[PDB]
Amino acid sequence: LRRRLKYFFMSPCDKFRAKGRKPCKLMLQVVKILVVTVQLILFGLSNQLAVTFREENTIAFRHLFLLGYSDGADDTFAAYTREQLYQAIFHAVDQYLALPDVSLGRYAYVRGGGDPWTNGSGLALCQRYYHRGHVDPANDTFDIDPMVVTDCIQVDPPERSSYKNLTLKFHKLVNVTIHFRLKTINLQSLINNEIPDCYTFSVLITFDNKAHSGRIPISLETQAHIQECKHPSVFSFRLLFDVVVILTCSLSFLLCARSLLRGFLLQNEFVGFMWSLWERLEFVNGWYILLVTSDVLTISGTIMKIGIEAKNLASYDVCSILLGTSTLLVWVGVIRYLTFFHNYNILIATLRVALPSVMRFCCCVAVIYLGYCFCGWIVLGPYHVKFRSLSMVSECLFSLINGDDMFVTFAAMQAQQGRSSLVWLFSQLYLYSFISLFIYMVLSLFIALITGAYDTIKH
Amino acid sequence: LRRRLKYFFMSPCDKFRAKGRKPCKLMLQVVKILVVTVQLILFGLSNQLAVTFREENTIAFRHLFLLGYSDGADDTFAAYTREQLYQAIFHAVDQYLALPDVSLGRYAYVRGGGDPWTNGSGLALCQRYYHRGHVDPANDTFDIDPMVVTDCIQVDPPERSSYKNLTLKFHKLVNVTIHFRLKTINLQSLINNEIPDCYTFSVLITFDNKAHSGRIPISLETQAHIQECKHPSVFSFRLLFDVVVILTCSLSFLLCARSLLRGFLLQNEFVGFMWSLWERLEFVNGWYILLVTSDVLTISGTIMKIGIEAKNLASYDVCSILLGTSTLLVWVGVIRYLTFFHNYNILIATLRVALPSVMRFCCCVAVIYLGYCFCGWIVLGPYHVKFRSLSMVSECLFSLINGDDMFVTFAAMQAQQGRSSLVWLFSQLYLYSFISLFIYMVLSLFIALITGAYDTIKH
Amino acid sequence: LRRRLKYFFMSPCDKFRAKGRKPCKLMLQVVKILVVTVQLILFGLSNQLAVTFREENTIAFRHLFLLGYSDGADDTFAAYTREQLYQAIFHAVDQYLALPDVSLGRYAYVRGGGDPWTNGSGLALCQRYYHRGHVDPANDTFDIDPMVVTDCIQVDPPERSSYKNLTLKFHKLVNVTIHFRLKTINLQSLINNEIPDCYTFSVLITFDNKAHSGRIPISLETQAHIQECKHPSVFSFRLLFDVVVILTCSLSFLLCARSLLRGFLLQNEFVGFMWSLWERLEFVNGWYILLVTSDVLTISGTIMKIGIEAKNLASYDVCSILLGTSTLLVWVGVIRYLTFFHNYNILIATLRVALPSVMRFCCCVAVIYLGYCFCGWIVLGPYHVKFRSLSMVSECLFSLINGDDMFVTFAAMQAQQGRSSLVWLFSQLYLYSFISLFIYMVLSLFIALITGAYDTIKH
Amino acid sequence: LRRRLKYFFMSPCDKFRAKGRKPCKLMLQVVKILVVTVQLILFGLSNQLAVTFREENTIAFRHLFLLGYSDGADDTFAAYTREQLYQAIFHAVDQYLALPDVSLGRYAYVRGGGDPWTNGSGLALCQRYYHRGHVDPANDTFDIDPMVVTDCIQVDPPERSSYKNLTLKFHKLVNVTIHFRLKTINLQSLINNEIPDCYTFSVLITFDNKAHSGRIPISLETQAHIQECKHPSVFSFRLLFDVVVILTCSLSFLLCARSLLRGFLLQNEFVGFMWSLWERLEFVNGWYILLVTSDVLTISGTIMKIGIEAKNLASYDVCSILLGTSTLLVWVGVIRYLTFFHNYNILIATLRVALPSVMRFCCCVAVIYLGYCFCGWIVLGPYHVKFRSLSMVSECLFSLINGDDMFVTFAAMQAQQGRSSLVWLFSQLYLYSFISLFIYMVLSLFIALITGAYDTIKH
């Protein structure tokens, strides 16, 4: 039993010397790195083109349908008078009706197909307002039933004006929306020698009055549905490569599962020979757990990628996350091979022995960090653009700790020095104390912990 | 006496083993953390909505009343000709008179109510100028009595033009102001299921000629007064939770005060048994001082929060500071529980033993920092936007020390290289010497001090 | 043989004491530093002027020929309607025809000279479209032969309108281009007392429809061909200095080659006397390899500079790279002289002994870095402007590691929090984990390695 | 002699115990710190107001006289067509003539007074062009005599149009300038209770054609001459405080000079008693050299400040530099008092013993830094806005070393990836290698040197 246990923990070179068995797993892992990386690169190159097509079409729609729109104004684009709102709505509808003769793109109309469109209707112009709304600020009185009523006007696309009678219920208006769909063909595909696919853009223009604040923001959003074109005509490798990736990962998974099973069996035998828990876990190869996880992630992502490229699936985000995480894991796995050489193993072991104390110090530091997050959010959120939400506060503080965006953070508060002196003084104390504590003490202690770990490894 | 003293300094686990008393204080502190954090989160979520409502209304007012206003121009918005100023004033008044038929919001006029409005007056247009002003730059002569005279024109809101005869005394003009109030109802409250409240915005538009420089900046400011609406009609938990918070903190305060009293009594007995000062202070639990302070802050802030939510108080800033500081303190207090475990206590003790030498080094560094602040303010303030005031200078230098906003600081001075060579050379010397000294020596010494403290703790 | 070997490894001072030979090489290296730096400075000063001339002319062309152009809009300048595109094209051609009477510069027309211009034609207006294109998004049908057909209209410059009949094939349009050349004389040369040279600017205006997305970007580019003017008349040192530089570097190269040859001969003799590889390499003077490389680079760059200044060559980039790299190398070579003094040699030796472990740690860190690069590119590239390409991803991550541009990176993802919650959560995990791992562990270990190297050198 | 030498090197407390002499110098230094800081603060507060007045007047002039000017366009404001240039010139002159009826400021005209104005002329409009200029780019021919001829038109201010016949020699034009003077009174002074002073603004508008590039930049500059108004009338402390400062610094200078003289005499006696150089220098009190320098600088700056405040001097820059440097020095001098306490002296001595090795390492690092500066300037200057000049290159590299403005530096080169692949690859290599070398090795070694100095001091 002792000889088998000694062989189990041998290095790959020692194992080969002892038994001369073929190191299939190592070469398989190298091939897996190569093929997984190539697949990720090809997938990303393909996806960037579709992203660009959708973005360009959406920008063109913003320039076509939003009255007075200019680049960079998305966050502040809003109406402020009744005539401005009416003009924006009518301009959007008129541009929709004039699209064939003015657009640089080639778009087809879509009619019907369920709500909010009636049969034969291409554009839906809907206003949503409270069922009953009486607002008398002069008497400080109001009587509102907050049930939302929707009233829609249906516009049919022109054959190649009732909507002008729209009357908005301003005092009880919740929002106005314009919905329509446009079909186009993505000719850009021919650059990559692909067959062009057929896009349906669902366009929603929102005039939002939920704040009831006298300012109505205006936005345009699109959702793209992609299909194979019914009759494509332009005067294999990808699917085969995906199959190769799947087979490689399946073989790797089988071999790693076999190794883990043998490890478990040897662990049980050794435990029996002795007639704790960490001693048992010493038999587990964490690198093989990592490889099995990467194999599962890659197989799932590749199946999803095959589905997406056939236009049967649209879950780009999940596929990308699976493939990217698996690629990260397989690239991290390379460190195992470096661990077999002493000069690299010393550094890897330095990090490994440092990690526990670093995590304990993180436990100590996290409570202070959270206290600062909450305090900053409650006090500075009303006045500081970077403190509006807790996640934003955490991002700001984390960036400050690493010496980024500090002066602008200080400068945003200079406007309130005369307005609210107490708030400005508190912000001074808060920012200075936080930055000093975290940069000059916490980071120094992280450096000291790593240095001590290195010293103990080297001696 | 020795047994009681030994029991006094026992850890909570040791205390429980020795006497098996109920650890009410510990569970109470955990509950306090939870409830205080929840209260802060709810208060912040409620306050953000009101902040947003006020901000949106103010932006809408800027777009409605300021001629030619656009987003982002607040700092530079100004008039430069007499006709520009007249047009801006008249546009503001005309928009005030036309508000009912053009605004997307629903506003009611307010009349009278004291100065600067007469009875029945909705808008006050006042010009302030020197009592006697004679300015003859051709003869380098002037005769001014700097007493300020105010002349106001009162405009009544329309029933649902004397102000056009305004004649500005340009050569002696101090400023022009437009004051008016608008009442509205905050319907947005219905999103959070709250009852809408009644807002009165006090709007002040200032055309400022204090510099007498040929450039007159124009600004709009608002102050919001919030009341319960007299007759609200929409087709408990908060107050009870605030009461629960107050009771929890009162119980914690009583227990901590009892512990501190027992500590004082034991200290007196021990001193008597011996028939210095720090030896006496060794009997004081600093964590309990922190807990008592947090309890007091939280109780005060919760009372103010109850007052504010009933529209009897408007001191949002003080309440927010109290609650945020108390939350920070209670979250910091968690470190006491970590001190009871050796592996975390080593790190906490490292920071504690480092602190004194760090403070002494800060004493050494502060005088150099202040000298640089004064020198930079006096020399570069005329030329550099980031050196206008001493607080701004301190913010700039502190950001530079942490590697932020450095290149822009250097680049601002590139314009003066040809204008004033001496100033540019001095700025080069100043910035390079400051940054090098503070980054490559001071920060390195902070790191060295922390490392030495860690080494001495570990050995 | 032992005495000769001892003399070979002696320091320059020891060598001079032993034999009193003239230290020609050292003084030659000092002179080389001086002359090479002076040559680089003069070359850069001369090149900046031509760069500025070309840039100013190009900006003027953008203002002259691009309808509605303004500074800062280069990246977003685009057309969105058919009439916008027609107006832009016609405006460019009309401005070309009106240039003599409106331009502030002095330009001459160029006719003929090969494609795309016919004989006597000054301007070429060409549209490129697919040979056969039928696109029916209504039926999800298309029939395209992607062979590109070019149709050009030739405009002759006016004597000191068929192009108005242009009909664009919008549905199959690939792009539109406008080509023309303008000749000018660079009078600015007189500032530096140089003789003005004759420029020919080749101007290309592109209206790009490759994306077929409804948005057509518009760009203007120039290529400058510089010649000696045929008959210049304005009412030596450079060539001589270049010759001096070449001679200095040739002498240095000869001396260094002699030293390397003697080193090789002594190495062979010592090997023979012993009747490994690194032992042999110990005889090689790396500083002399550096000096020989710098001499070769400088001689090549100086020949190219002579050719360029005579208008016989236009390879500015290669010449600049050669001269700059050689200057960097010669300035780096100064460290050799510092190595001869103990107090500087300790620091140099600290860096030298640290380098190997630093490189091994870089091997360990690079795989993690690459995994993060790939994962970030695939997942965040669709949503984040800084993750579009792999090189951009590497730049972003490298900047994040050094505490730059962090908050903006976090803020770019705040828009997708509501759109795609999964992507936003993944981005949070990705960014936080990457930054924490690389700043708080990797950089700390680099510091620890350098500190250990310094400690071992000092003891 | 031994007792006197021992007393000489005693600390102030030891000196007082030994002889009980009055420590006048110490209290005098404290008073000096106080009064010098107060003087600097008052001077800076006074200077900021004048700076603001001049800046506001200049901005108003830009809005008044520059056709189509808007804030933020100073760097790019330029003309591109002949009609644009004519319109800008005529608009400036017409606004000058209409100033009394349109300006919000109160300005008086200035006539005559030497060149460029004739007697009775308020505005001078001058074009400068080459004496002989023939430019024929069609034939690649030119004949230029570069002697500059100036032709001026004189406009008299209106009494409360020949300039319209201006014909510009475009092909030989060097520049166009408009010169005029405006007198105003600074009423803003009344805010600080000062007596208003009389300003004369000299306004120069330049249309610059030196590049001959088809783009003519337009700029406006002002120079302010300040006088006491002849007959001021508005319905001491500063001079007395300046005198007090001068007396305090004179007394401090006398005492420090006496101490230095006694040190020199004791050094000579000790040298004589022994019947090297650094041993002699050990007798010199560097803090007293610093105090003497600060006294001299403060006295000079205070005399200049007195002159300036009386309107007899206008050298604000030199006065500010003197006073700021003296304030910095006096604040730095406080460290001497901290050196007398052991716990602060250990840190001060750590920095002192670290300084030499840090300077030697700086010698080693500077040559590499300079090589990189030259290489980057020559190679990337044509393409990168941050590499235009050597000082700008140094600022950029220094900021990069400290982790600032890194991603934007990388991003500026992304445009040239397709244009010039070789340059982009070189920029990648250059930036990555520089940043890595300087952050991961050089800064780490600075940290190691400081840590070693601290360790040797502590042991």
Ligand SMILES: CCCCCCCC(=O)OC[C@H](COP(=O)(O)O[C@@H]1[C@H](O)[C@H](OP(=O)(O)O)[C@@H](O)[C@H](OP(=O)(O)O)[C@H]1O)OC(=O)CCCCCCC
């Ligand atoms: C659970 C399912 C298991 C499937 C695999 C069953 C086939 C099978 O045993 O192959 C042996 C080798 C294994 O290749 P590989 O895994 O590289 O080789 C093993 C490892 O070196 C292992 O060390 P660690 O990796 O450190 O644990 C070692 O203990 C084993 O020695 P031992 O056997 O004496 O205990 C080796 O056999 O593989 C091939 O030669 C490729 C052909 C694969 C054919 C499968 C086609 C699907």
Ligand SMILES: CCCCCCCC(=O)OC[C@H](COP(=O)(O)O[C@@H]1[C@H](O)[C@H](OP(=O)(O)O)[C@@H](O)[C@H](OP(=O)(O)O)[C@H]1O)OC(=O)CCCCCCC
């Ligand atoms: C000044 C006013 C005092 C008010 C409290 C008086 C009631 C009272 O003694 O309760 C005992 C425990 C204390 O709970 P708690 O404070 O957790 O328990 C004490 C701590 O463990 C203390 O250690 P340190 O915290 O390290 O100092 C220890 O020395 C005491 O032992 P000793 O007594 O033998 O000296 C413990 O009694 O509390 C309850 O069991 C909850 C019921 C609270 C009822 C109050 C309702 C308002």
Ligand SMILES: CCCCCCCC(=O)OC[C@H](COP(=O)(O)O[C@@H]1[C@H](O)[C@H](OP(=O)(O)O)[C@@H](O)[C@H](OP(=O)(O)O)[C@H]1O)OC(=O)CCCCCCC
């Ligand atoms: C391969 C072609 C070689 C060309 C040079 C042949 C002429 C020639 O030997 O000059 C001797 C000295 C060398 O000057 P230089 O190179 O400075 O001097 C040598 C170095 O000090 C060398 O040390 P390292 O540099 O550390 O290796 C040392 O070993 C040699 O001693 P040794 O000779 O006893 O072995 C020295 O002669 O140079 C002149 O005195 C300038 C006149 C140059 C005339 C060349 C005009 C073109």
Ligand SMILES: CCCCCCCC(=O)OC[C@H](COP(=O)(O)O[C@@H]1[C@H](O)[C@H](OP(=O)(O)O)[C@@H](O)[C@H](OP(=O)(O)O)[C@H]1O)OC(=O)CCCCCCC
């Ligand atoms: C070169 C011109 C010298 C002018 C000063 C001549 C007057 C004069 O000796 O005053 C003695 C003290 C000095 O005050 P102060 O300088 O503070 O005192 C001296 C320092 O403590 C000095 O130590 P270090 O500072 O470390 O070198 C020490 O060696 C001297 O002892 P010793 O004398 O036994 O050698 C002290 O006399 O000063 C006053 O009591 C104020 C009245 C100043 C009156 C001056 C009005 C203008």
Ligand SMILES: CCCCCCCCCCCC
């Ligand atoms: C052993 C205790 C020593 C305490 C030293 C504290 C020094 C405080 C200086 C604060 C400067 C900001």
Ligand SMILES: CCCCCCCCCCCC
């Ligand atoms: C023991 C004293 C040694 C002093 C060494 C100073 C070196 C100065 C170099 C300055 C480079 C900027």
